[PDB]
Paper text:
Eukaryotes possess eight highly conserved Lsm (like Sm) proteins that assemble into circular, heteroheptameric complexes, bind RNA, and direct a diverse range of biological processes. Among the many essential functions of Lsm proteins, the cytoplasmic Lsm1–7 complex initiates mRNA decay, while the nuclear Lsm2–8 complex acts as a chaperone for U6 spliceosomal RNA. The Sm family includes the Sm, Lsm (“Like Sm”), and bacterial Hfq proteins. These proteins share a conserved “Sm fold” consisting of an amino-terminal alpha helix followed by five antiparallel beta strands that form small beta barrels that assemble into ring-shaped hexamers or heptamers. Here, we elucidate the molecular basis for Lsm-RNA recognition and present four high-resolution structures of Lsm complexes bound to RNAs.
Since deletion of the carboxyl terminus of Lsm1 generally enhances binding affinity, we therefore crystallized the Lsm1Δ56C–7 variant of the Lsm1–7 complex bound to the U-tract RNAs UUUUUA and AUUUUG and determined their structures to resolutions of 1.8 and 2.1 Å, respectively. In the structure of UUUUUA bound to Lsm1Δ56C–7, the first uridine is disordered and not visible in the electron density. The next four uridines occupy pockets in Lsm4, Lsm1, Lsm2, and Lsm3, respectively. The terminal adenosine reaches across Lsm6 to form a hydrogen bond to Asn66 of Lsm5. This is the first observation of Lsm5 interacting with RNA; Lsm5 is not utilized in the Lsm2–8 structures. Furthermore, Lsm5 is the only Lsm protein out of the eight studied here that has a noncanonical nucleobase binding pocket because it is missing the arginine that typically forms a cation-pi stack with uracil. In place of arginine, Lsm5 has an asparagine (Asn66) that forms a hydrogen bond to the terminal adenine. We further tested the effect of 3′-end nucleotide identity on binding and found that tetrauridylate followed by a single adenosine binds more tightly than an RNA with a pentauridylate tract. The trajectory of the RNA in Lsm1Δ56C–7 suggests that the RNA can thread completely through the ring, provided the Lsm1 carboxy-terminal helix is removed or displaced.
Numbering used by the authors:
A (entry chain G): 24 to 108
B (entry chain C): 8 to 57, 68 to 92
C (entry chain B): 1 to 93
D (entry chain E): 5 to 79
E (entry chain F): 3 to 73
F (entry chain A): 15 to 83
G (entry chain D): 1 to 82
Write the structure that this text describes.
Amino acid sequence: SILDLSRYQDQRIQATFTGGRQITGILKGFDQLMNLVLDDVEEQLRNPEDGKLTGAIRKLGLVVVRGTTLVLIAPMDGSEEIPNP
Amino acid sequence: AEPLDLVRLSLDEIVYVKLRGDRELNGRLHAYDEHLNMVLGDAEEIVTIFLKTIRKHYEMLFVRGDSVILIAPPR
Amino acid sequence: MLFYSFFKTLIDTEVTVELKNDMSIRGILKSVDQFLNVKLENISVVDASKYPHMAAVKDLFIRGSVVRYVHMSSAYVDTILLADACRRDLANN
Amino acid sequence: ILPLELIDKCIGSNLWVIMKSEREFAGTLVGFDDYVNIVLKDVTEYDTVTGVTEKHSEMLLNGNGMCMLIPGGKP
Amino acid sequence: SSPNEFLNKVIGKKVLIRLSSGVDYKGILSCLDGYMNLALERTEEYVNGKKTNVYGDAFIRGNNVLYVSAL
Amino acid sequence: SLVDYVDRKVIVVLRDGKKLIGILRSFDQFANLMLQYTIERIYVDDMYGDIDRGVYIVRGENVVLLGEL
Amino acid sequence: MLPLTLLNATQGRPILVELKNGETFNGHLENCDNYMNLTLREVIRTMPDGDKFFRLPECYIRGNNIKYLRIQDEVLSQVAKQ
RNA sequence: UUUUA
């Protein structure tokens, strides 16, 4: 893979799925198909209509993430919501 | 013995086809393939809109298989 | 390649392509490939005023994946030979 | 930790499946294949927009739309 | 394959097929293939809660199938 | 193939409805497209306005049609 | 010059990626493959409505989520020269 | 993982 996931081992990453779901969790494992094991997962819930984040979260614990539905992966450290650059 | 046999046994018969996007077809099946691409002859389309239906007629109609949901042979 | 061959028999005849985005384009079929991409010439768009960006286009390429339908006038020879060919594929393949 | 080994360790135990759409399933993991199509038994299906739930005795779930598989089931 | 074992044991029995659109089909599972294309006999179609169609035989293209459930 | 359109001005319509007008420079077997000197043309009924956009690589699955101009 | 050949030549340079849902990612292209999977560095993520923005140190984008990419004309010129 | 999801 062009992404060396071992660099994120035991770091919190953000994952976005096709269809809009967004989670964060601590990377505990992965395979060559980009399935992941994340711990301490939180899902950022969205509004039913607008599909935009509401600010609320739900805790999901230890989760297997399917690599087929993953569309975005990014480390949390160094991220931040910013004003219009 | 395999699902496509239902379509095979419908060649030259009037079939009903349910498609994505709230569309239905009734027409004589002249050919199909493993994608469920098909050609229907003397075909009627019913487009449902939300409640209302629009009816259209085609002398000869190629249908791309990726829109197909269901095919029913005639009774 | 049953439907590839079918469409090659329609080259230089008039067809109408209905796209999944609900635009319909009538024109002369000039080309088709294994993916059922098509090229149309001397096109006319149905409800053309709804698609003003098409007004200066005379020739176009359509990706096979965005086609919902291709419809055309019927001919007896076309229909019986196409059914023949489908049955031939079934007996052989 | 290998993701599919965690899933295999969940066989016979509760598994909670979150689809890409507003739909979830929770039940006993019977088994799964190389595409992670999954067989669940004693299942509850959740529409997370309407809140309606349905029960199923045993079912094969298409893995195409699965986003998350959570061993231990749903709280 | 557990998916194949389950399917093999509901062949010839009544099953509920839910499509990704949420449209439901209840029928007798005749056979299937590697694409999850299905053939059903004695098929009832349901939209929301209401029965909208019946088919003596129906072919269902496998890409739309969300699940196959035993009844 | 699209080779007949290379180095010609084309309009590309995308699945999201965008209209791109540029010089087709290359394509591949997915109908991925590479366009140079591209503008995005935004329509409201028969009116439009253009945005300079530069070079695009359009992923083929998003291409509805390509028309010679 | 094929589209993916240009993409490979864009490594190390600024790029704009628009996703199928209209999100955009401005960053430097770190890597790509024949799926059009991408890795970017020093990223600005703009949400579809243009209303919320995020800074990411790096990110990975699966190729089948991409609508299009934009690159500088200067890049195409310099790559054609070499 | 783009033209048969």
